[model samples]
Target: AAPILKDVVAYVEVWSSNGTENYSKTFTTQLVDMGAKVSKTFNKQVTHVIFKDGYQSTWDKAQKRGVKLVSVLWVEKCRTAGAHIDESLFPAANMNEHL
Candidate 1:
C-alpha cells in the first residue's frame, strides 16, 4: 500500500523527551500537520506510539493495546516523503547521538 501511513494515528511518549515541548513540536506537531492524528496520551484510539526505546512493561501494554512503537525518525521520513513510508524503515524508537 502506498501513502504508507494514510490515516494511521499516533501518540508521543518518548523517554528522552521527558514531556518537553520541543519533543512535542518535533514528533507530535509535525505528524499532525502531515495528516496523521496525534494524541498527547496513550489511548485506545492510537494506532502508533513514538518513543526513544522504552520499558518492557510499556511495550507489553502497547502490544496488548494494538499500538506500534516507532522511532522518531519516522516523523522526518514521513515529512520528507509527504506521505507514509514502509514501517520497516522506522524501527523501534531511538535517539540520535550528539544531536
Candidate 2:
C-alpha cells in the first residue's frame, strides 16, 4: 500500500458564516521563498488561503486572469489539447479559455 501523506491539505477556503462579518488573508512573495503556495478557496461568503507566495505564486497569478467557464477546473502550462474539440466544435473559443 502507498504511504499516507503526512501533510494533507484540505478545505483551503474558510469564510465566516455571518450576515455581517469581514476578514482578510494576504501573502507576500517572501513567503514563497520560505516554502508557500498562493492558494485560496472561494465560497459563497468568503475566501480562504492555504499558502501565500513562492511555488504556489504561479497558481495564484494564473487564477487572477479572467475565467470564462463555470466548472471546477485546474489550469496547466501544457498545450497538448484534446483533438479539435473546441476549435472544430466551437471555433470561436479555445481550451485555454477554460481551466
Candidate 3:
C-alpha cells in the first residue's frame, strides 16, 4: 500500500492526564506505521495537531500557527480509509480556559 500519510507532519498532544491507556505511544506507532512524520515537539513543520484536551497553550499555539487541529478520531478515519480524509469532518473542539 502507498504511504497515505507521507505528506503529513503531526504533533500529538496529551489526551488525558489520568488515563493509563498510553495513547501517546499508540499514536506515535500508528502514525509512523502509516508513514506520517511525527514530531516530539510542535514546530513550524507540523501540519496537524492531534488534540483531545488539557493542553490549552499548545492548542492555542497550533491555531495561531494555522495548524490543522484534529481529534484522534481523524487518525483512525484516515487509517480506515487508507488515505487522508477531510479534516473538517474531524475538527478538534474549541477549548476554553475559563470554563
Candidate 4:
C-alpha cells in the first residue's frame, strides 16, 4: 500500500532560530517514513515547506511560487491521525504558541 503522504513532496527547512540540525534530520526521516518525498533543496518539485518559525530565504520564494508553508505540528497531526490532515489546521503563524 502507498504511504499516507504519498502525494506530498516536502522540503524541511533548518533555521538557527527554529531548531537544531538534528531536529531537521529527524523530521526528514519522519516524512520519509510517512511516504512523503523530502527534498534536500527547495526546488520546483516541492509542494510544501515544513518549518517552525522565523524567516527563511526560501519562504519568500515558496510564497511567490504558491507552495504551502506549514509548521511541524502538521506532520505530528498527520502521523497521529494516520492520514494527511488539512494544512489550515497547522498554520505557521501559530507555531510559536505551541513551542
Identify the leading candidate in terms of TM-score.
3
Query: Taking the tens digit of each residue's C-alpha lDDT, what string does model 4 give over 1-99?
Result: 239998899988644563553367788888898999999888889998887553445666767898888888898888988988998787665344434
Report, for every candidate in turn, its global Cα lDDT versus the true structure: 0.67, 0.24, 0.82, 0.77
Every model's TM-score:
0.69, 0.18, 0.86, 0.81
Cα lDDT of model 2 by residue, 19-85, tens digit: 1432223222322223333334433222212221222332343246322111111111011231111
Q: Report clash pairs, candidate 3.
A: none
Candidate with the larger TM-score of 2 and 4:
4
lDDT of 1 by residue, 41-76 (tens): 677888887766445555667767766767888878
lDDT of 3 by residue, 1-99 (tens): 558899899998746755444477688778888899999889789998988763788878987899888888998988889887999899887456457
lDDT of 1 at 66: 65
Give the Cα-based TM-score of candidate 2 against the true structure.
Answer: 0.18
As a whole number from 0 to 100, the lDDT of residue 47 in candidate 1 is 86
Best-to-worst TM-score order: 3, 4, 1, 2
lDDT, residue 83, model 1:
71
lDDT of 4: 0.77
Report the Cα lDDT for residue 92, model 4: 63
User: In candidate 4, which residue pairs clash?
Assistant: none
lDDT of 4 at 27: 81
List of clashing residue pairs for candidate 2 = 32-54
Ranking by lDDT: 3, 4, 1, 2
Better of 2 and 4 by lDDT: 4
